[PDB]
Amino acid sequence: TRREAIRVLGLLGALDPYKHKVNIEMLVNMGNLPLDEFYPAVSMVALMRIFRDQSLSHH
Amino acid sequence: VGSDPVILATAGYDHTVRFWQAHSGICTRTVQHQDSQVNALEVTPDRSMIAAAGYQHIRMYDLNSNNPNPIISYDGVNKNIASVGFHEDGRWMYTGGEDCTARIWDLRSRNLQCQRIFQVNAPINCVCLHPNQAELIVGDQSGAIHIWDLKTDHNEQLIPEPEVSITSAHIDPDASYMAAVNSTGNCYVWNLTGGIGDEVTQLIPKTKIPAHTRYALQCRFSPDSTLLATCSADQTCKIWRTSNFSLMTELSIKSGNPGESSRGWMWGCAFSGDSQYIVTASSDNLARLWCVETGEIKREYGGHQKAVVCLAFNDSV
Amino acid sequence: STINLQKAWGAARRVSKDDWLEWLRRLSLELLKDSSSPSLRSCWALAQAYNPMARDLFNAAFVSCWSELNEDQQDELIRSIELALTSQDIAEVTQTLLNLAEFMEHSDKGPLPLRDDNGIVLLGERAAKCRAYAKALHYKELEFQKGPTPAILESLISINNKLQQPEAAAGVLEYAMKHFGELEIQATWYEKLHEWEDALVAYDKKMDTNKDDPELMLGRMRCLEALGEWGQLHQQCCEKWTLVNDETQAKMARMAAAAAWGLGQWDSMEEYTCMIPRDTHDGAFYRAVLALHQDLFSLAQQCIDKARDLLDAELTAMAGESY
Amino acid sequence: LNLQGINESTIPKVLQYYSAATEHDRSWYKAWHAWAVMNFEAVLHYKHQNQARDEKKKVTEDLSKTLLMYTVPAVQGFFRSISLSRGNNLQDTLRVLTLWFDYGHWPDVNEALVEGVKAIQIDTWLQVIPQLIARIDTPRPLVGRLIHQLLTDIGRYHPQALIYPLTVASKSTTTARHNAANKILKNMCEHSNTLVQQAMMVSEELIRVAILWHEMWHEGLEEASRLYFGERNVKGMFEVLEPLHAMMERGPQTLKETSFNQAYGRDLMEAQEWCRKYMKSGNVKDLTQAWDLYYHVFRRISKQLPQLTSLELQYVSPKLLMCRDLELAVPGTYDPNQPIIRIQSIAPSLQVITSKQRPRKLTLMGSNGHEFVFLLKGHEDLRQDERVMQLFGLVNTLLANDPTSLRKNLSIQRYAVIPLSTNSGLIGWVPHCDTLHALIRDYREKKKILLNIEHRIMLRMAPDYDHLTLMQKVEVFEHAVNNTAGDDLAKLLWLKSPSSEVWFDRRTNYTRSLAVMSMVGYILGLGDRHPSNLMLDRLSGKILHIDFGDCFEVAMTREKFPEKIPFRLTRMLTNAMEVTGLDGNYRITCHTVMEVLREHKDSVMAVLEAFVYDPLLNWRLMDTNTALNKKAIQIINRVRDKLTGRDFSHDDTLDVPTQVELLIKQATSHENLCQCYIGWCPFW
């Protein structure tokens, strides 16, 4: 299947990368806020990241 | 100052003109010059009064009396005055500025307005008086040299190199060779045809000397005409023998260490009475008296708060 | 509160990726526990269960700890980081440490002093190995700003080419030209920059001055192939065969076969292709081409299959980072 | 054409070649476009030749016959070329407008024009709406009636593309322009009348917001004081003051106007009374009393001005607060293809920016739910910016067409500009951007670095810098640059960037956009690029230019503090690019852009010529001077020399790489840089 994938890729032609292109914050937090305010900010961002989705059902 | 046979006036951005003594090197007196700096100092051939060129005004201070006010302040000009000439008779004063109009002034006449005007295209950067007292050399930012005849007003425009600013130009007293210098650092030399009445004054290019790599500020022939000093922004005042155009002596004020940036430009050259010594100004606020043959600082002048941009020297008896 | 920290620092007994990953997890959890900020210290229990929580809070916890340390635990931690980066380097741990270093550079504290010069060289090597070419270019540019060297220029050109910036690499070459003249510029720079004509001139003059060498011969031949002057390439190949050792012969065979194919000399083409190693994609491709010329279609199909099998690795490695 | 050139002999042979080419291929766009361009060029050449010979009876009639014979083929070819192109017809449409406005008074040319107008689709004319409206009051009735009919059709189909400039025209001081605008508007009203009424009320209220009565008094009194105490022009004094009193005579209309009349209205009426007493008597004691009252109210409004930080619609204009779900389209947003984004509501609060002009910050809400922020500019003409933006649109189209430019992702950042009057107008507010001056100031304040460190250093070395000569200036500038680390922009860019990958992408975009705008600006003759006049995008990193007030070498022509720098290329930007310098992305992008623009010199020339020959924009040239036609021809020739490459030396043609190198040397030259005004920040 690796061979067939490579073969079909060659058959379809080596697409120009530009043609492929046309076919297709925490650091900022530190840069803006001082450390004392930054610590709760990053903490809350990560906690919300866990808070959404089904990982919350575990944590 | 005036009584002393040797006059050495030095000034810069500090609004003062200081007359040093060659034998000692002590500031004899200072003259206030407000409202601007001075762009060029020159002593009249008669030695009666010095002249200071600044911005929009041409001041002339007395040389014999001490602590005088400006006797004459020729106003009515704009856009600075780069340099000033002086007729050997002492009647006509030649000046040039950035307004592209060289002006002729009559010291004896009261009239504030100038006498003759030569307008050019680019701002005038230097003016030099031919020893024959019949032609005026005028440079410009465009690099076109102009030879203004004082009798026929027939100006011959010559441009050694297109689109380079010419900064200074001088002719030896014997009218043998003329040197001109531009911001590229080249030193153009022209042979002078032996013509006075015919006014042909044909310039024959002799040699193009790569004098400097950076901006070259001023040049001047020695009285004996065998020597030609050349200053530049490289902080090296190079000296060339007229016969061969070779660097016999290189007067440098470099720190001798890579860890030093923009020590100070050097734009001053004045040969001694017999060309033994040479007075050189610098942006280090320190003028220096060098020995031509050896190349050593015999004496050093200090006391200026700001950069030194002008000089004066005269050994006339 | 620095005993387990020191144990984690000076352990240096990991011989596997999972071992170093466990070290990273222990370091992150200990940093959270020792963090002065109670907001950070409160997430230690959650981070124990969930690894992304520790990873996200890694930078902030490190900043808090590093600010707390009185320059001596700082020295010890810096030395431990140097040991981790230099020895037993691993992609994930290296990327995490590089992100830490970038975060510190961004912060007002300043970059972490690593083996002097803030570890500009070591971080550059690590970023290049982990294929963080943006970080590699940044660190190499800082090294250039500290001082320009031909090696720095060469590395800059390589990084820019790997970053798809031929214009920037050409600017680098222009800077090299203006500052170092011509001698310091190796023809390999033109070869990387695809300035094949200039490379050809450089190789010609180097061959004229310095005695003929296998490396210069191979470089000029590569430029010849890139231009397409099959006549000159084949002339050089025929002229220099018995004068060539076996390793340089193996490197020769590929370009010689390309020239022979371009000119239509099939006998020479077979001679060179037999010399091309079989374990090369080019070798398999040229063997298949000869099979097609001789109408050996079954062997051609088998050889093409082998060529694809070999191309597996190269295609996977290159497709791993962008298209 | 390349070999022989242009002269009497060449034209018939070239015309035969192009006519035969068109006959051999009717549907080919290139053949028809070339034939039309050749005929138009021949018309211009014959006109210039007759101007040079005859001016410097029968000959005039012969020229009329020859030009008429050359014109109709040009018109027909241009119309067919537009129809064939269908999308890239900006140059051909502008050429059609030039021929129409020049020789449309002739019956034969008018017949060709009307036939071509009937054949051509109406959508094309949307591109040149400002050009059409620039000549609404053309003296020639034959051309005027056809223009009016065309605009009537434009009103019938896509009315939203005409309502704004029609509204601007309706309120013009000159009688003919407003007469023609109202004549078109009455015909349009029979179609809708609702877009009409909404546009009128919107424009009036927006102008009222843009300039407030107290602000009008402040500026008028400033000019009045300059006239009297400076120039002693009492008659001009009364001429300047009287329109404000005439605007008082309307009476208050909003809460702000009522409050102003209560506070200052009595004093102003008293001052007018004393002025009238002076008029009938001529007494210094009579005039000085009005002067005392004027200065009193001037001081009061001067004190009040800083406090006007924000404006609420309920005071300034309750009508805009009333506006809800307007069919009137958002300015600068209508597109014939995309759905109309009509205004839903206007925000109640406008945040006035504390600047010299005090521009408002208007923000509309569209029917799609996306906010559209704009800046309300007062007492500044925006027609020039509109023409510049049209040129930028053409250049963007050319760059998109070019494969190399499209590959490199080269483009010009542009914002919607909508003139509202000769004084005020609307400017599209670009988000996520900040002036370079603001970035530098913020970084230096963060790093505890003195904001004017370079100026302080140069002043300390030489207090008389402004009066120093050239060599003293350059020495002072070099000392300041050497003794200062010019890496503020690069350092702040690196710090602002979140990660190194985004940092590199941002830097690449910054360098490419800077090169593109530098080359386009040089061709356009754009100067006065001080750091506040160009903005850096904090997300994409692309460079944006604003305030195209001076163009076509105005800064070079003006005697006071002349600018010798074709485009801003300061050392801080140079450091902000790659460590190598200009030799990489900047130079290569400049090569590509200059090559593309030199390729499409005909299109660039057509766009430039249209709004250079536009009468409404000749006041700039007249102000620069110290007649009109010679100045326009001279500037067009200068830009033509720029595009051809003969600008540096008339005799010698220059290739793209050599010209780019010379431009870079001129921009980076210390001698050329130290002439720039200190506020332009050459040291930065």
DSSP-assigned states of every residue in B131-183: TTSSEEEE--TT--EEEEETTT--EEEE-SSTT--EEEEEE-TTSSEEEEEET
CA D245 to the chain's CA centroid: 32
Tokens of D487: 């890496």
Q: Which helix (H) or strand (E) holds D638?
A: helix D628-644
Query: Could you tell me if D660 and D587 are in contact, meaning their C-beta atoms sit under 8 angstroms apart?
Result: yes
**Cα–Cα distance, C301 to C291 (Å, whole number):** 9
Name the closest residue on chain C to residue A18, using Cα atoms. C323
**Cα–Cα distance, C23 to C29 (Å, whole number):** 10
Note the residue count of chain A.
59
Query: Could you tell me if D50 and D59 are in contact, meaning their C-beta atoms sit under 8 angstroms apart?
Result: yes
Note the residue count of chain C.
323
**Cα–Cα distance, B1 to C82 (Å, whole number):** 72
- Amino acid in the structure at residue B144: A
Query: CA-based angle C74:C75:C80, to the nearest 5?
Result: 95
Q: Partners of B181 in the beta sheet?
A: B168, B187
**Cα–Cα distance, B222 to B171 (Å, whole number):** 9
Name the closest residue on chain A to residue C311, using Cα atoms. A6
| Sequence-distant (≥ 6) Cβ neighbours of residue D420 within 8 angstroms | D164, D168, D203, D206, D207, D210, D382, D426
Query: Could you tell me if C231 and C263 are in contact, meaning their C-beta atoms sit under 8 angstroms apart?
Result: yes
Check the annotation: does D547 bind a ligand. Answer: yes
Tokens of B311: 């000089």
Name the closest residue on chain C to residue D584, using Cα atoms. C171
Whether the CB of B235 is below 8 Å from some CB of chain D: the reply is no
Query: CA-based angle B85:B86:B89, to the nearest 5?
Result: 160
Cα of D656 to nearest chain B Cα, Å: 20
Whether the CB of D560 is below 8 Å from some CB of chain B: the reply is no
| Sequence-distant (≥ 6) Cβ neighbours of residue D239 within 8 angstroms | none
HSE-up of residue D655 (Cα within 13 Å, Cβ side): 2
H helix count then E strand count, chain A: 4, 0
Task: Measure Cα distances from B67 to B16, B30, B64, C159, D193 in Å.
Answer: 12, 7, 10, 70, 86
**Cα–Cα distance, B180 to B220 (Å, whole number):** 9
Residue contact C67–A35, C-beta within 8 A = yes
- Which chains reach chain C with 3 or more Cβ–Cβ distances below 8 angstroms? A, D
Check the annotation: does D104 bind a ligand. Answer: no
Buried b (16+ CB within 10 A) or exposed e, C280-317: bbbbbbbbbbbbeeeeeeeebeebbebbbebbeeebee
Task: Measure Cα distances from D26 to C257, D91, D261 in Å.
Answer: 51, 20, 70
Tell which of A25, A27, A45 to mutate to test the D interface (max D CBs under 10 Å): A27
**Cα–Cα distance, D332 to D664 (Å, whole number):** 36
Name the closest residue on chain D to residue B262, using Cα atoms. D479
Residue contact C308–A3, C-beta within 8 A = yes
Whether the CB of C167 is below 8 Å from some CB of chain D: the reply is yes
How many CB atoms are closer than 10 A to CB C40?
24
Phi first, then psi, for residue D410 (nearest 5°) are: -90, 140
**Cα–Cα distance, C7 to C80 (Å, whole number):** 10
Name the DSSP letter for residue B124. P
- Please report the DSSP string for B86-105 in residue order: --TTSSEEEEEETTSEEEEE
Interface of D with B in 642-671 (CB under 8 A): 671
Locus of tokens 């004392």 = A36
Tokens of C133: 């070419």
Cα of A28 to nearest chain C Cα, Å: 9
Please name which of B16, B14, B17, B20 lies closest in space to residue B1, comparing C-alpha atoms.
B20
At D419 the three-state DSSP class reads strand
Q: Partners of D93 in the beta sheet?
A: none
Buried b (16+ CB within 10 A) or exposed e, C220-257: bbbbbbeeebbeebbebbeeeeeeeeeebeebbbbbbb
Tell which of C99, C133, C167 to mutate to test the D interface (max D CBs under 10 Å): C167
Please name which of B120, B78, B79, B111 lies closest in space to residue B93, comparing C-alpha atoms.
B111
Name the DSSP letter for residue B119. E
Sheet (strand B277-280) strand order = B270-271, B277-280, B287-291, B297-301
- Which chains reach chain B with 3 or more Cβ–Cβ distances below 8 angstroms? D
Check the annotation: does D429 bind a ligand. Answer: yes
Residue contact C107–A55, C-beta within 8 A = no
Whether the CB of D123 is below 8 Å from some CB of chain B: the reply is no
Whether the CB of B289 is below 8 Å from some CB of chain D: the reply is no
**Cα–Cα distance, C136 to D489 (Å, whole number):** 21
**Cα–Cα distance, B115 to B92 (Å, whole number):** 9
- Please report the DSSP string for D510-541 in residue order: HHHHHHHHHHHHHHHT-----GGGEEEESSS-
Burial status of residue C15 (CB atoms within 10 A of its CB: 0-12, 13-18, 19 or more): exposed
Cα of D496 to nearest chain A Cα, Å: 7
- Amino acid in the structure at residue B1: V
Phi first, then psi, for residue B89 (nearest 5°) are: -65, -30
- Please report the DSSP string for D650-669 in residue order: SSS---HHHHHHHHHHHHH-
Chain D positions in Cβ-Cβ contact with residue B167 (cut-off 8 Å): 471
Burial status of residue C167 (CB atoms within 10 A of its CB: 0-12, 13-18, 19 or more): buried
HSE-up of residue B261 (Cα within 13 Å, Cβ side): 8
**Cα–Cα distance, D23 to B63 (Å, whole number):** 90
Query: Do the two chains B and A touch, given a threshold of 8 Å on CB pairs and at least 3 pairs?
Result: no
Check the annotation: does D171 bind a ligand. Answer: no
Buried b (16+ CB within 10 A) or exposed e, D640-678: bbbbebebbeeeeebebeebbbbbbebbbbbbbbbbbeb
Cα of D478 to nearest chain B Cα, Å: 8
Q: Which helix (H) or strand (E) holds C119?
A: none
Domain tally, chain B: 1
Chain B positions in Cβ-Cβ contact with residue D463 (cut-off 8 Å): 13
Residue contact C56–A26, C-beta within 8 A = yes
Q: Report the first-to-last Cα separation within chain D, whole angstroms.
A: 47
**Cα–Cα distance, B214 to D268 (Å, whole number):** 65
Please name which of B268, B267, B207 lies closest in space to residue B241, comparing C-alpha atoms.
B207
Three-state secondary structure string covering D323-349: CECCCCECCCCCCCCCCCCEEEEECCE
Please name which of D176, D164, D651 lies closest in space to residue D416, comparing C-alpha atoms.
D164
Residue contact C309–A7, C-beta within 8 A = no
Give the count of Cβ contacts less than 8 A between chain A and D: 9
HSE-up of residue B123 (Cα within 13 Å, Cβ side): 17
Burial status of residue D107 (CB atoms within 10 A of its CB: 0-12, 13-18, 19 or more): exposed
Q: Left, alpha or beta for C116 (phi > 0: left; psi -120 to 50: alpha)?
A: left
Whether the CB of D2 is below 8 Å from some CB of chain C: the reply is no
Query: Could you tell me if C240 and C207 are in contact, meaning their C-beta atoms sit under 8 angstroms apart?
Result: no
How many CB atoms are closer than 10 A to CB C97?
23
**Cα–Cα distance, B13 to D461 (Å, whole number):** 8
Check the annotation: does D603 bind a ligand. Answer: no
Phi first, then psi, for residue B155 (nearest 5°) are: -95, 125
Check the annotation: does D341 bind a ligand. Answer: no
Whether the CB of A18 is below 8 Å from some CB of chain D: the reply is yes
Alpha-carbon torsion (D493, D496, D501, D506), positive or negative: negative
Tokens of D635: 């500037």
Angle between helix D585-599 and D656-668 (nearest 10): 130
Query: Do the two chains D and C touch, given a threshold of 8 Å on CB pairs and at least 3 pairs?
Result: yes
Q: Partners of B177 in the beta sheet?
A: B191
Name the closest residue on chain C to residue A48, using Cα atoms. C53
How many CB atoms are closer than 10 A to CB C176?
23
Please name which of D381, D377, D513, D436 lies closest in space to residue D680, comparing C-alpha atoms.
D436
Name the closest residue on chain A to residue D406, using Cα atoms. A18
Buried b (16+ CB within 10 A) or exposed e, B255-276: eeeeeeeeebbbbbbbbbeebe
Residue contact D671–B125, C-beta within 8 A = no
Whether the CB of A27 is below 8 Å from some CB of chain D: the reply is yes
Query: Could you tell me if A59 and C49 are in contact, meaning their C-beta atoms sit under 8 angstroms apart?
Result: yes
| Sequence-distant (≥ 6) Cβ neighbours of residue D591 within 8 angstroms | D656, D657, D660
Burial status of residue C177 (CB atoms within 10 A of its CB: 0-12, 13-18, 19 or more): middle
Please name which of B194, B38, B210 lies closest in space to residue B130, comparing C-alpha atoms.
B194
Chain C positions in Cβ-Cβ contact with residue A1 (cut-off 8 Å): none
Please name which of D473, D603, D588 lies closest in space to residue D37, comparing C-alpha atoms.
D603
Whether the CB of A34 is below 8 Å from some CB of chain D: the reply is no
Please name which of D79, D88, D85 lies closest in space to residue D36, comparing C-alpha atoms.
D79
Whether the CB of C108 is below 8 Å from some CB of chain D: the reply is no
**Cα–Cα distance, D504 to C133 (Å, whole number):** 10
Q: Partners of D363 in the beta sheet?
A: D373
Buried b (16+ CB within 10 A) or exposed e, D5-25: eeeeebbeebbeebeeebeee
The CATH code of the domain that includes B193 is 2.130.10.10
Helix extents (H) in D525-600: 554-557, 571-576, 585-599
Give the count of Cβ contacts less than 8 A between chain A and C: 64
Name the DSSP letter for residue C211. P
Whether the CB of D483 is below 8 Å from some CB of chain B: the reply is yes
CB-nearest to A27 from D406, D407, D498 is: D498
At B10 the three-state DSSP class reads strand
Name the DSSP letter for residue B8. E
Chain C positions in Cβ-Cβ contact with residue A35 (cut-off 8 Å): 63-64, 67, 107
Name the DSSP letter for residue B49. B
Residue contact D499–A18, C-beta within 8 A = no
How many CB atoms are closer than 10 A to CB C77?
21
- Amino acid in the structure at residue D497: S
| Sequence-distant (≥ 6) Cβ neighbours of residue D307 within 8 angstroms | none
Note the residue count of chain B.
317
Q: Partners of C291 in the beta sheet?
A: none
| Sequence-distant (≥ 6) Cβ neighbours of residue D640 within 8 angstroms | D601, D605
**Cα–Cα distance, B249 to B297 (Å, whole number):** 13
Please name which of C198, C176, C171, C179 lies closest in space to residue C187, comparing C-alpha atoms.
C198
- Domain hosting residue B85, numbered range: 4-316
Query: Do the two chains B and D touch, given a threshold of 8 Å on CB pairs and at least 3 pairs?
Result: yes
Resolution (A): 3.7
Sheet (strand B8-11) strand order = B8-11, B16-20, B30-32
**Cα–Cα distance, B126 to D174 (Å, whole number):** 54
| Beta-sheet pairing, B270-271 with B247-252 | unpaired
Whether the CB of A35 is below 8 Å from some CB of chain D: the reply is no
Alpha-carbon torsion (D592, D645, D88, D333), positive or negative: positive
Locus of tokens 């310039």 = B203
| Sequence-distant (≥ 6) Cβ neighbours of residue D375 within 8 angstroms | D353, D359, D360, D361, D362, D426, D427, D428, D429
Alpha carbon dihedral C187, C188, C189, C195, in 10-degree steps, equals: 70
Alpha carbon dihedral D72, D75, D79, D82, in 10-degree steps, equals: 150
At B84 the three-state DSSP class reads strand
**Cα–Cα distance, B267 to B280 (Å, whole number):** 7
CB-nearest to A18 from D407, D495, D496 is: D407
Tokens of A41: 């900010």
**Cα–Cα distance, D183 to D166 (Å, whole number):** 10
Query: CA-based angle C60:C63:C64, to the nearest 5?
Result: 90
Please name which of D66, D54, D53 lies closest in space to residue D11, comparing C-alpha atoms.
D66
HSE-up of residue D595 (Cα within 13 Å, Cβ side): 12
Q: Which helix (H) or strand (E) holds B190?
A: strand B187-192
Phi first, then psi, for residue D436 (nearest 5°) are: -60, -35
Name the closest residue on chain D to residue A32, using Cα atoms. D496
Name the DSSP letter for residue D51. I
Helix extents (H) in C210-295: 214-227, 230-239, 246-263, 266-275, 281-293
Residue contact A17–C40, C-beta within 8 A = no
Whether the CB of A3 is below 8 Å from some CB of chain C: the reply is yes
- Please report the DSSP string for D157-218 in residue order: SSGGGTHHHHHHHHT-SSHHHHHHHHHHHHHHHHH-SHHHHHHHHHHHHHHHHHS-HHHHHH
- Amino acid in the structure at residue C141: E
**Cα–Cα distance, B27 to B34 (Å, whole number):** 19
Locus of tokens 């500020």 = B217
Locus of tokens 């060469």 = C154
Tokens of B133: 């007292």
CA B219 to the chain's CA centroid: 8
Cα of D558 to nearest chain A Cα, Å: 44
Name the DSSP letter for residue D422. S
Q: Which helix (H) or strand (E) holds A16?
A: none
Chain B positions in Cβ-Cβ contact with residue D474 (cut-off 8 Å): 215
Burial status of residue D150 (CB atoms within 10 A of its CB: 0-12, 13-18, 19 or more): middle
Query: Could you tell me if B262 and D479 are in contact, meaning their C-beta atoms sit under 8 angstroms apart?
Result: yes
CA D240 to the chain's CA centroid: 27
**Cα–Cα distance, D542 to D509 (Å, whole number):** 5
Please name which of D483, D480, D477, D529 lies closest in space to residue D674, comparing C-alpha atoms.
D477
Task: Measure Cα distances from C307 to C283, C304, C312, D428 in Å.
Answer: 8, 5, 9, 58
Angle between helix C91-106 and C72-86 (nearest 10): 140
Name the DSSP letter for residue B83. E
Locus of tokens 């009348």 = D193
Angle between helix C91-106 and C120-129 (nearest 10): 140
Locus of tokens 């001789």 = C294
Cα of C43 to nearest chain A Cα, Å: 8
**Cα–Cα distance, C75 to D608 (Å, whole number):** 66
Q: Partners of D625 in the beta sheet?
A: none
Whether the CB of A22 is below 8 Å from some CB of chain D: the reply is no
CB-nearest to B183 from D462, D483, D671 is: D671
Q: Partners of B147 in the beta sheet?
A: B137, B156
